[PDB]
DNA sequence: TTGCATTCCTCTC
DNA sequence: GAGAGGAATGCAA
């Protein structure tokens, strides 16, 4: 689903089109309304061959943004109960 | 526990 | 109403 090339190209696709700000929304010459997920959809395509829907693109954004929340938190937690104890203890 | 999908929200047009 | 991104849920493994 995410496999090493797809994921190659939707990692080439994050490059390349960068963050949105708080427009979501643009239009293209002929009208058609485009999104940063459906752009980075359609350039793996481009590169790929594979679909990959404008929602699996969301999904798959999503669940890299928990992940770097959680390793930076599990971060400030392992030594938040180290100190916690060390503490705990001087008492 | 979490990587997937799927709904809910709120924007532009 | 159409269609979008992104936060909320839903859901096996």
């Given at each position: 689903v995410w496999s090493p090339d797809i994921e190659q190209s939707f990692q080439e696709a994050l490059?390349?089109?960068?963050?949105?700000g708080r427009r979501k929304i643009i239009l293209s010459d002929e009208?058609?309304?485009?999104?940063?997920?459906?752009?980075?959809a359609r350039?793996?395509?481009?590169?790929?061959?594979?679909?990959r829907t404008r929602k699996q693109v969301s999904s798959h954004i999503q669940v890299l943004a928990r992940?770097?929340?959680?390793?930076?938190?599990?971060?400030?937690?392992?030594?938040?109960?180290?100190?916690?104890?060390?503490?705990?203890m001087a008492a």
């Open positions: 490059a390349i089109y960068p963050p949105c009208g058609k309304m485009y999104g940063r997920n459906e752009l980075i350039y793996i395509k481009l590169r790929t061959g594979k679909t992940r770097k929340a959680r390793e930076i938190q599990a971060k400030l937690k392992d030594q938040a109960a180290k100190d916690k104890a060390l503490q705990s």
